[PDB]
Design a protein around this ligand. Structure first.
Ligand code: NI
Length: 214
């Protein structure tokens, strides 16, 4: 779902960046209060894992790309605040060193994949636990819903571009396809393929973590 440079207007990039700053600020404060130094390697490993998983992606006509993220996996293991930091680090490295996701689009991409995905997934996870579903199942379902919520946010940010930013002749200045195109394209991919991969990876890793070794 990473939005490349030039897909969102500078105004949209600025708004999303402004939304993500308070999120990361709170995250830093929360982590500083609850984490000690010996928990840092877990955040780093989580960040490297998400980074790696996202590198396996396919193009979506009418959208951007589809791939798993590991957002709910990180939220359930590290907590959602630490997850937002680990996930943002991964996106930062992708944008700056690999050209994957635009640099000015970092606010938008982190808002989607490092805030919406882990927090929605975590919330759904907690909901499923309260219904007495086991942690493996609860995390997988949370993973599915979280990544789809992030895909929906991505599609909405994209689809608003031709509506909000066009020439006097009606030509889109940035992403050229509206909500009618972006939503079905991004959601079809994430509801059927990317979401299932996300759910399976999440449940698999949670299962083995809980089993402690095997
Ligand atoms: Ni992406």
């Amino acid at each position: 779902m990473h939005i490349p440079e030039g897909y969102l207007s500078p105004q949209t990039c600025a708004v999303m960046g402004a939304a993500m700053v308070p999120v990361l600020t709170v995250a830093a404060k929360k982590v500083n209060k609850s984490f000690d130094k010996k928990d840092v390697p877990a955040m780093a490993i989580g960040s490297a894992f998400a980074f790696t998983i996202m590198m396996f992606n396919v193009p979506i006509p009418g959208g951007t790309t589809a791939h798993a993220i590991g957002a709910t996996l990180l939220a359930t293991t590290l907590g959602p605040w630490a997850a937002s930091i680990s996930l943002t680090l991964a996106l930062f490295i992708q944008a700056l060193l690999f050209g994957d996701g635009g640099i000015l689009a970092l606010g938008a991409n982190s808002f989607n994949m490092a805030f919406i995905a882990p927090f929605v997934g975590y919330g759904i996870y907690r909901l499923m636990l309260s219904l007495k579903l086991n942690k493996v199942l609860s995390s997988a379902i949370g993973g599915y819903v979280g990544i789809n919520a992030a895909a929906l946010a991505t599609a909405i940010e994209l689809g608003l571009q031709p509506l909000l930013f066009h020439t006097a002749n009606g030509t889109p200045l940035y992403f050229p396809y509206g909500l009618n195109v972006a939503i079905p394209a991004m959601m079809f991919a994430h509801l059927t393929v990317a979401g299932i991969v996300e759910a399976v990876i999440t449940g698999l890793v949670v299962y083995y973590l809980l089993e402690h070794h095997h």
